[PDB]
Each structure stands twice: as C-alpha cells, then as structure tokens.
Amino acid sequence: MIERYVEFVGEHEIDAIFKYAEKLKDLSILHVNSTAAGGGVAEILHRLVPLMRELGLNAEWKVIRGSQDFFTVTKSFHNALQTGKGEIPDEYFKIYDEWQEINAGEIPLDYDVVFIHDPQPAGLVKYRKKGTWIWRCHIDISNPHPKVWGFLRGYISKYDGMIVSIPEFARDDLDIPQIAIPPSIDPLSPKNMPLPQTTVDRIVDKFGVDRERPIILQVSRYDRAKDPVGVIESFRLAKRHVPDAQLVYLGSPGEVVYRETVEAARGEKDVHLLMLPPNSHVEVNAFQRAATVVMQKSIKEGFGLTVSEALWKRKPVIGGNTGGIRIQVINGVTGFLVDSPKAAAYYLVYLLKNKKVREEMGEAGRDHVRRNFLITQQLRRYLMAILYLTKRH
C-alpha cells in the first residue's frame, strides 16, 4: 500500500518514511484509545497502524472498556476541557482513577513506545513499566476547566511527550515536549477514494435526496460541539435566497441533540437528518462528492477531519472559527470561518451563487490538503516523534 502514495506526495517523502522505519524496526509500539468504530481517532488508527505494520514495525492497538458511568465522566471531562464550563462532582475523579486501575489489569503495557489517545486512558501512565510514553491529545485544551485540567495535568506531566493537533493547543504549564501533528486523510481509504458517479447517484437517491438540486452537507455526530441546531438555523436563513438548496446532516450514533435538531428543522422538508452506522465510509464519501458546499460549523473542534475530507474532494467548507478548523479553512481561499449561524448563511448564499469561486476554492482545498494533511505526512512526523522522544527517554 505505502508504494501507492508516490502519485500524491512523490518518491522523496516515501524514501524518508522507509528510513525512519528502518531505525525503529526493533521497537514495540502500543496505541490505547476508547473506541474501535467511529470518531476521528479510530478512523486515523484504522489506517495508520496497518501502515506501521507494513513498514515492519511491531505496532499494536488496544481499546479500554468502561461502564456508562465512566463514559459519562470522560464525556463531562471532554466538554469541561473544551468549553471550560460544567460542575464536576469530586466522585467523578475517583470513578476515573478506579477505571484506570481496572484497564491496567486487562492491558499489558510492556512496550518500548505507548501512545495514549485523549483523556479517557491518560491515567494508565500510573502503571507505566518501561518505555517511552506519549500522550496523543485530539481535543482543544487551550482554555480548559481549571480543576479537570489540574487533575489531568498530574498524569500528562509523567509522559515523555505530548502530541496536539495544532500548535495553539501547546500549554505553558507543561515542561514535556509538546509536538503539533494534525490528523490526516488517507486518499486510498474507502472514505476518501475516487467513486464512480453511479455509486454516488445510487447512495444519494437511496436516502431520498435529489442529486439535480444543490446539496449542503455537514458530516458530524448529533452533538452540541458540532452545533446541528446552528446548521439548521444557517440553512433556514440561506434557503430564503436559495430556495432550490437541500441540507443533509449525516451523523452516526446523550443523543438528545437529534430530537432538538428534528424540532429546529420542523416546517422545512428539504432538511434531511440522516443517521448511518459508523462503518458507512463509502456513504459519507458519496455524500461529500455529491455536496455543492460542505459545513463543519463546530463550536469546538480539535481538528475535524471531515473538513480535509471535503477539501480533498474539491468542496468548499464553511467551518466554525475555532481550533483545528482554522488551519484547514483559510478564510476566502479553501472556505470561510464563521462565529454565528447568520455568517454561515451569508457564505452559503455567496458560494451557491458563485460557481467559479466554489471550483477555485475546491482546487485550493485539495492542494492545501495535499501539502499539509495526507496520511504520508502524518506517518512521517509520527516516526520522527518516536525517534526523537525514545532517544530522549
């Protein structure tokens, strides 16, 4: 597979990857996250770990488990770290510490390199035997809930290194190496690969959507950070000026936000609130290819790979003005950054009325992703991070 990327990035970048890999051949690597299906992390690791094994690295991926009480606390930590808001019961921290002990009984941690993904398994560093520990942070920790951050920083400060998705998430209250590596698209994955028009038409018609009329698409969870209510409001304001346009919200399974979204949508039937299983990579691909304009109007976003996915398919993106959306959406070049539903509506109308601009944005989007956000560059920077941090350990 690794040899097939040459056509996108060129022989140089692939030679560099083989050389870093040669220097890492005798190291065992563990990745630990919280889900094997759906979400940015799982989608990265499903592509990146097979690439690592192909390069002859002893690379393994384990998933922690928990009671819904644990996943309640980690979800409240996630929101508290990103928004800086919420009351956190003192009990929440004991539940967390308890489930770090449990998973540390059921997951062997004798590797040369351990990558811990996001806050859920961060406490496993208590039970670190030998090897280089790296905290892979996928979320916005720039302005966190002081008490939840205070706690987590106690664990983060025992790692050999932190990886964040953009430099702006680097903390002045950590002394460990903080390295910026954005998530990437795999151009050959089922999510991103070329499709025949037939596949696109088939999948679009199946879900009741008209391929002859403009499609506005957000791919995201029915979650408050993605602001699906705000996307509806955006579409409602714009629809007055583009009465031929359709909205497709394409989610995967709180989930109270869905009902709130169905409500905010009541009285408009060109709004299609879809829910697919997390495996439905070709379906997302088809819809992103069928879209005229893609939205990712997140309130908070670590990166948002759905943006690079749309840009790679030469779609302009209206992105929320926050986190890693800012490094993907170059205002007026690859899309537009917005602070409100009203701004989103202005840019929706502008893009739908301006064909040549959408197409220019599209080309600039794909080139931006080529230069910055392809799996080959993520992989290369991962191997460089490992080489650097293992040598320091």
CB 308 within 8 Å of CB 328? yes
* Token reading at 58: 């002893």
* Gyration radius (Cα) of the chain, Å: 21
Q: 319: annotated binding-site residue? A: no
Q: 84: annotated binding-site residue? A: no
CA distance 289 to 313: 6
Neighbours of 301 (CB within 10 A): 27
Q: 309: annotated binding-site residue? A: yes
CB 270 within 8 Å of CB 247? yes
Q: What is the DSSP letter of 125?
A: G
Q: How many Cα atoms sit within 13 Å of 146 on the Cβ side?
A: 0
Matching residue, tokens 């966190």: 144
CB 246 within 8 Å of CB 231? no
Q: 169: annotated binding-site residue? A: no
Crossing angle, helix 40-54 and helix 305-312, to 10 degrees?
A: 70
Residue 78: closest CA among 120, 50, 44? 120
Residue 372: closest CA among 114, 184, 187? 184
Given its phi and psi angles, is residue 39 left (phi above 0), alpha (psi -120 to 50 degrees) or beta? left
As a dihedral over the C-alpha atoms of residue 112, residue 118, residue 119, residue 123, rounded to 10 degrees, the angle is -10
Phi, psi for 31 (deg, rounded to 5) = -100, 135
CB 30 within 8 Å of CB 60? yes
Neighbours of 363 (CB within 10 A): 12
Burial class (CB in 10 A: 0-12, 13-18, 19+), 83: middle
Q: 154: annotated binding-site residue? A: no
Residue 66: closest CA among 108, 117, 121? 121
Residues with Cβ within 8 Å of residue 170, at least 6 apart in sequence:
164, 178, 180
Residue 142's Cα: distance from chain center in Å? 17
* Token reading at 273: 């609130």
CA distance 333 to 319: 12
Please give the domain boundaries of the chain with CATH numbers for all domains.
Answer: 2-184+374-392 (3.40.50.2000), 197-372 (3.40.50.2000)
Instruction: Give how far Cα 295 sits from Cα of 250, 260, 333, Å.
Output: 11, 19, 15
Residues with Cβ within 8 Å of residue 287, at least 6 apart in sequence:
203, 204, 207, 215, 217, 219, 248, 250
Q: 106: annotated binding-site residue? A: no
Residue 305: closest CA among 378, 202, 237, 255? 378
Residue 48: closest CA among 163, 158, 203, 125? 163
Q: 301: annotated binding-site residue? A: yes
Residue 313: closest CA among 270, 373, 353? 373
Identify the helix (H) or strand (E) that includes residue 364: helix 355-372
CB 182 within 8 Å of CB 373? yes
* Token reading at 374: 């392809």
Q: How many Cα atoms sit within 13 Å of 255 on the Cβ side?
A: 4
Resolution rounded to one decimal, in angstroms:
2.2
CB 234 within 8 Å of CB 348? yes
Matching residue, tokens 């936000």: 257
Q: 276: annotated binding-site residue? A: no
Neighbours of 385 (CB within 10 A): 21
